[PDB]
C-alpha cells in the first residue's frame, strides 16, 4: 500500500542523514578506522537482502527459500579468498560475522575453552579491547571475562613490539592463542617471530587485520597468511566495505583441530543467529573492488599520504610513536606539547578536523589520552594527494596551537570545564577556530565523496 | 567514479534482482521474516555506515558525532515511546547487533561465567541463545559459558508447564529465568513467571523477538508490567532492520544497576563501533510502530494466522496447543504421517517457504515432527483472511504431494528423499509445478515494499 | 641428648591426654561416626614411619630409602582389596588419601572438570558436606565451589531415598557424577537402582562408604562394588582404623576413562605431597583385623545392638525415621515428642551421653534440628550387648524426659534461655541430671576401652 | 582382645622394625626429613585419635570436646609464641592435615576459582602445591582450579630474578604471590616481595615448610614482618608430626577478614574432623620449639650445612648459588659429567639417602643434573661439623662410584646392572657410612 521514501516517511531522520552527509563532505575525516564506502556497497546494503533468514551455511540451511542467498554467500567467499590471493584447498573463510568484535569472539569460542589463555597487544600500547583488557578493578573486555588474557607490550623507548620479552612471557604464561594485529600500531608485524614464539608453546596463532586488510590485499604490507593459522578482519576499515566481519582459517588440521568445523559451528549455532545477507551483498561488492588495479593504487596512495603527513608533522616538531609509520596511520605523542588528546580532539572537531584522542606508551592514566591517532584512508578515498596531506598536517598543527591557547584560558581542570568553556558563545578564540574551519572546509569541499 | 551497483557489480546486481523476484512470486511464511519498508532500506543504505561512534551519546571515543548522537537519542526515545514506557522507569540500549548478541550482553551484564539459567527447551519451541546442550556437546554459546537447564511444554496441552517450572526452578536455583520463544503459539503468563522468579530470587527477562510488534500494538500482554529486562530483534514483528535492543528497569533489581551493567556489557564489554545505519533504520521503524496503521497491521496478522489455523483444522491437521494467540502456528505433522523436513522441501519447490520445526513429543531431534507457519510477511503485502485460507489449502496440497513422494522412496533417509525429488525424472514434477502455479498466481497479485 | 617420654617432656599435654582418656572411659559414646581404635593401630601410628618422605607409589618414588615403606604400602593395598573381597585384576586402590573429604575431592579432580555437574544426598536429609552443599546465598562446601552440585532427597514420610524423584531430576540436570552414601541414613542403598539412573545419563557412579565400610566388609550390608565405579571411605569410623581415607576404583575403562591413572595422579602429584606412612601403617593393621571372624562378629553385634536400642525406643513411644534401621544407627524424630535435638543433646551431654542433634525430613528450620542420631559401634567395641543397649535406650528416654521438663520451665523459646536455665546453680533438675549421670557412668565404667 | 602390635600384626611389626633399623644405620640427608621425638610419637599414638571435633574451640558441632578444646587452644598459643607473634595481630589454624591441604585451603579462602597465583617454578626448586603445568597437562590441582604462572631464578646467580618477577607480576596481575620453596638455598627478600605484591594489589604468602624451625630460632629473616599469610608443614624444619598450620593477619587485608575466610575454608570448606592426635604432637613440638635447645640445634643445622658445602667445594663440586644460607645445598652435577638420578640410587645402595633434584639449566626435565642434601635429620642425631665434612667425603666417594658404575654401562639400564662388579666398593662405602651413623642416638619410641 503506502511505502514512502525516507524524506516523506520520516522527515526528521532524513534531515539527520543529510546533516551527517554534509558534515562528511566538508570535514577532514582523519579517524584511522573510518573510510567512505561506495555507492555500490550502500545500494547492496540497502536492498531486499535484509529480508531473509538463512541460518546455517550455503546448501546446509535451516529454512526454505535460500537459493539466491547461497549464490551470494558462495560468491562472497570466492572473492574473499581471491582478494587475499589464497588457495582454497589451504584456506577457508566465513563471511557471516556481524562485526570485528564478534568475529574475534567466535574464533575464541571455536578453538578455546572457557578460561583458556590468550595474549594480545596491550590496550594502552595500541591494542584492541577484544583481544583482552583487565584493570586492577575489573575485567573490562568480555574476552577477559570468559578467557584468561595477558597482554604483551611495546618497548617504550622504540614504540615497537618487544618481541624478546614476548618470547619470555609466552614461555611462562603458556597461551593457547597468541593474537597479532592492532588498533593503533604504526608498523608492520614480524609474523615469522610470532610463529616461532607460538611454536615455543604449541599456541594457535591469529592475525586480526581489521585496520590493514586493504593494504595486505594490495600487497603493500606483508602477508599474514604466510605464517598464521587464523585471520580475522572487519570489512569497514581499509577494506572500504560495509560494517561486518570475516574469519579466514587453515583447512589442514592445526594442533589436531579441524579449524573449519570449529569456526563455522562457533559462528552458528554457537554465537550468532541469522546471517545479515544485505551486509554480505556489500561485502561481495567491496571484495570485487579489492582485486582491481585501482584499489592497489589507492592503497599505495594511502601509505604515501600517511608518510607525507608524518614527515610534515615531524617538521612541525611533533614526536611520533615509533618515529614514523609503515602503514595508514600515525600516532602523535602530544606530551612535549603539554596538552592531552581529549582537548585537541575537541578543538579540531570544532574546526571540522575529526580524529580521535589515543593513549600513547608512557601515559600515566588511561582516563587521560596522551596523544592523537591520524589516518589517511578516508581522505585518500576522496582523492587527496601527498601535498594535500602536508596541508592537513599544517591544519592539524594550527589546531593544536589553538588548543594550547584555549587551555590557558580555562578555570577548572576537568575536561568538562574545557568543553563548557570552548562551546560557550563568548569563547574568545571563536575567530581563530572559525578561520581554521574555513581553511579545512575549503580543502575538503574541493573533493568528491563516494556514496548514494 | 562512484558507479551505481548495476555498473559497479553487475553479478551482485543480478543476484539481488533474482532475490527480489523470488520474494515477489513466493509465499513467504517463515514466522520470523517480514518485508521491511523502503524508508528503512534507505536509512540502512546511507552514509551513516561511515561513522565510528563507540560509547554513548555525548560520551564518545571519537570526534564528529554530533548528528550520530541526535540519531541515537531520537532512536532511544522512539524505542521507549513505541512500548509505552516511562523513561524514568525504563532505559534502552539500541546498539546490539542482533538478537543473539543482545541476549549474550544481558548475560554478561548480570551473570558470572557458569551461573545458572533456565529457558524454554529448544525442541519445545525455544531459542538456542537461551541454552542448548545435547548429551555429548554444548551447542549454544550460552551453554558453554553458563549452566543451562530447560523448561518444557506440557505435551497434552502444548502450553508451557508452569507447575513443573515452579518445581524445577526450586531445585536448580537459576540466577536468570528467560521467558520468550521462537515457536510458541500462545501468550505468556508474565505474572506466573514473576512468581516463580521471585520464589528463587532470580532475574526475569523477556525475549520478545518474535512478538515485539504485537506487544507494541497492545495485541498481546505487556511483559514490561512484570519483567526486569526485555530483549528483542529489530527485525521480525517489529518490521525493522536486522538488529537488536535491550530494555531494562532503572530501579535497582536485586541491588544491580542494570543500566550501567547492560550498557557496559554492550560496550566496552562485547561490541565495538555501533552500526549507525542500522540504528537509523531502527529509528524509522519505531516511528512507524507508534502509528494506527501499524496497529491495524498487527491485528490483521493475528486474524490472518487464526484464519490459516482454522482451515488447517478443517483439513484435519493437529496444531500444537490447538491454535494460536499470535502471529504463528506450529503444526504437529505426526498425525498426518510425515515429518517437517520432507514437507519443507516440497513446499519450497512450490514457492511456499516455511520451516520445519520440532514438536513436543518428537522421539528425535534429528527428525522434526512439525512445521512452523507465520502470517507477518504475507500480511505486510496486503493478504487477508480469505487469502490465508487459500494458503492453508496450498500447504495441504503440498503435504499430500510430500506423502506421495515419501511413498516412492526406499530409504526413508532424508538425503534419499532429497535426491529423489531433485532428480530431473522426479515423477511428481507436474504436481509440484501445478501447485507452484497456484502459489505464484496468489503471491503475484500483491505489492511488496522496499527500494 | 634428652629424648624424654611425654610425661616429662610436656606435662600439660600429658595431663590433657589423660583427662581425655578418662572422659572416653566414663562416657557412653553414641555418636554414630565414632569408634575406639586398637592398641595395635595406635602403636603403628605412633611409630618412626612418621619420619619418611615417600612421594609417588611403590617402586616409583621420587626419593631413595623407601624399600620398607614400599613393602608396607603394597601390603596395605592387598589387605584393602582382600577385606572387600575384591579381584585385583578388576579393582585397584589408593591408600594415601589424608581423610574422607580429601578422598572424595581427589575422585572429583580425577574424573571431572571444574564446574561439571554432581548430584549427592542433600545435607539436611543426611548426606555429607563433601558431596555438595549450597545455601541460597553461598557455596559452603569445596565441592559446590569447584563443581555444580544438585542434591537429591529422601521421601518426606518414608525416610527413604526418593529413587523415583532422583530418576527424574538426574534426567533434567545431567550430572557427570552421582554419589551414593550418607552420614545419617538408616537403610541400605539400592545400588542397582543408582546404576540404572547413572546409565540413563551416562554419569559416573560413586559410593562413599565412610559410615558403613565395616558392615560392607563383614557382608552385613549389600556390596556397592557389584554396581559402582568408584568407592571412597574414611579409614576411621566404621572400619575402626586410624584417621585416613582410601579410594577404590575399577581398572576396566569407564566411559572411555582410565580411572587408575586418573585417580592416582589426582592424589599425587595432583593434590597431596608425602604420604603419611604412619597412618598407612595403622590402616594396614586395621585391614588385617577387618578380614577376621571376630570383626565379622563385632559387625553383626553392631546391628543387633542398634536394633535392641531402636526397639526399646519404640516401646517408649519414640518415632524413628523410616520406622527403624538396617545398620549401625538410628534417627529419632523428636517432633511428636514435643522437643528438638539441640535441647536433648545438651541435657544428655550434661549426663555423659554423647550423641548428636540431627535434622529430620520435614523440619521447618535448619537452625532447629528435629531429631537425634544414635550409633552403636563405639559402645559395641567396648563389649556392650543387646541388654546394655536396651539400658542405653532407657537412659536416653530419661534424658528426653528431663529435657522436656526443662523446656516447660523456661518461658523463652530462645535456646540460650534454655542453656542459661540448665547451667544455673539453682537449676531445679540438677539432681535428676546427677542421678542419670551416675547411672550412665556406672554402665560405661564396667567395660574396657582399647588403646595404649 | 587388644594385643600389642608385635602380636596383633607381626608382619607390620617386622616392617616397622626394618624401617627403624634403616633409619638408625643410614645417613639420612633428604632436606625435608627429620626425626621427631618420642614425646611427639606418644601424643600422635594416643587416644586423641578417637574424638570428632568438627569446628573450632567452643564452636564445635559435637559435645564431649572440653579436653580437645583445651588442647587446640594450647596448640594455637604455642604456635604464636614459637614464632614470636602478637595474638592481637596474628591468628593461626592448627587443623590442616599436611602442607598441600594447608596451601589449598588458603587459595580456597581468599581466591575465586581460576584466580591468578604466582609461585617459584617447579624445575627451579618450587613446590607442586604452588602451581605446575606442562605443555600437555595441568599437573598440580592448584593449576586446575586456579591459574598459575611461575617466576624463575636468574640462572647465572641461582637467586630469584626479582626484576623479572616485578615485570611479569605487572603483566599477569596475580591475586596471590607465593614466596618459599622446596629446594632454594638462600634467604628471601621479603621487602622486595611486598613491594611487588603491592604493585598489583596481591595477597602475599610465605610457605615456610622447609625453614620454619630456622625462622622460629631467628636464624633466618622473619616473614611475619612483611607477609599476610604464612603456611607451613609441621614435619620438616619444625621437627614435629606430619601436619600443617596456617598463620594469618587479623587486620583486614585488601578488605578481607583472613581469619574468618581461612577458618571457613579449612572447615567446613575442604576438611572434616580435625586429627587431634596430630594436634597433640604438634603442641609438644611447639613447646620444644620455644626452648634454648631448639635455637642451638638450628644454629647447628646451618653450621653443619656450611661445613658440608665447604668440603664439597674443596672436592671441587659446583653449588647452585655458590653455597647456602640455610639447611640445604643443591649440588650441580653436570660439570662432574653425570646426572642426579644415577648418583641417588648408588648413594642409597650405600645407605646415603638424599634425592635427585633439577638444576637451573637442565635441558631435559626428564634428567636432573643435581642433588639436594640437607643437614636437619643428622644434626638432630648429634652430628657436628667434622662429621658433616666426613659426610661430604662419603658423598664424594659415592659419586666416584656412580661415574665408574656409569662407565661400566652403555637408559634406565643403569638400574638393571646395579640390581654386579662394583658391589665391593658400594659395600665398602656402606660400611663407613653405617660406621658413622650408628655412633649416634636416634629419637623416637
Ligand atoms: C584490530 C581491531 N579488531 C577488531 C575491531 C572491532 O571492530 P568492530 O568495531 O566492528 O567490532 C577493531 C576496531 N577498532 C576501532 C576501535 O577503536 C578503531 O577505531 O580502531 C580493531 O581495531
Ligand atoms: C614449600 C613446601 N610446601 C608444601 C609442601 C607439601 O607438604 P606435604 O608433603 O605435607 O603436603 C612441601 C613438601 N615438599 C617436599 C616435596 O619434595 C620436599 O621434599 O621438599 C614444601 O616443600
Ligand atoms: C526468541 C528469539 N530470540 C533471539 C533470536 C536471535 O535473533 P538473531 O538471529 O538476529 O541473532 C531469535 C531468532 N530466531 C530465529 C527464528 O525463529 O527463525 C529468536 O527467535
Author numbering:
A (entry chain A), C (entry chain C): 82 to 533
B (entry chain B): 83 to 533
D (entry chain D): 83 to 492, 496 to 504, 508 to 533
Please share text taken word for word from the publication where this structure appeared.
SHMTs are α-class pyridoxal 5′-phosphate (PLP)-dependent enzymes which transfer hydroxymethyl of Ser to – typically polyglutamylated (polyGlu) – tetrahydrofolate (H4PteGlun), producing Gly and 5,10-CH2-H4PteGlun. Here we report crystal structures of a chloroplastic SHMT enzyme from the model legume plant, Medicago truncatula (Mt), which similarly to At has seven SHMT isoforms. MtSHMT3 is a member of the α-class of PLP enzymes, and its overall fold is typical for this family. A subunit of MtSHMT3 can be subdivided into three regions: N-terminal arm, large domain, and small domain, consistently with other SHMTs.
Soaking with Ser the MtSHMT3 crystal that grew in the presence of PEG and 150 mM ammonium acetate allowed to capture three snapshots along the course of reaction, killing the metaphorical three birds (intermediates) with one stone (crystal). The three different stages, within the asymmetric unit containing two tetramers are: PLP-Ser external aldimine (chains A and D), PLP-Gly external aldimine (chains B and F), and PLP internal aldimine with free Gly (chains E and H). PLP was bound at a partial occupancy or absent altogether in the chains G and C, respectively. Importantly, the reaction proceeded in the crystal despite H4PteGlun was not present in the crystallization milieu. The presence of Ser leads to the formation of Ser-PLP external aldimine, which changes the conformation of PLP moiety. However, creation of the covalent bond between PLP and Ser forces the rotation of the plane of the PLP ring ∼20° outwards from Nζ of K318. The side-chain of H292 is actually flipped to interact with the carboxyl group of the Ser moiety, salt-bridged in turn to R454, and H-bonded to Oγ of S114 and Oη of Y144∗. The complex with PLP-Ser external aldimine shows its unique conformation, with the PLP-Ser γ-hydroxyl group hydrogen-bonded to Y144∗ and synperiplanar to the PLP-Ser carboxyl C atom. This lineup, whereby the hydroxyl of Y144∗ also interacts with the PLP-Ser carboxyl, suggests Y144∗ as a potential base in the H4PteGlun-independent retroaldol cleavage. Y143∗ is shown to adopt a conformation ready to stack H4PteGlun in the states wherein the cosubstrate is needed in the active site (PLP-Ser and PLP-Gly external aldimines).
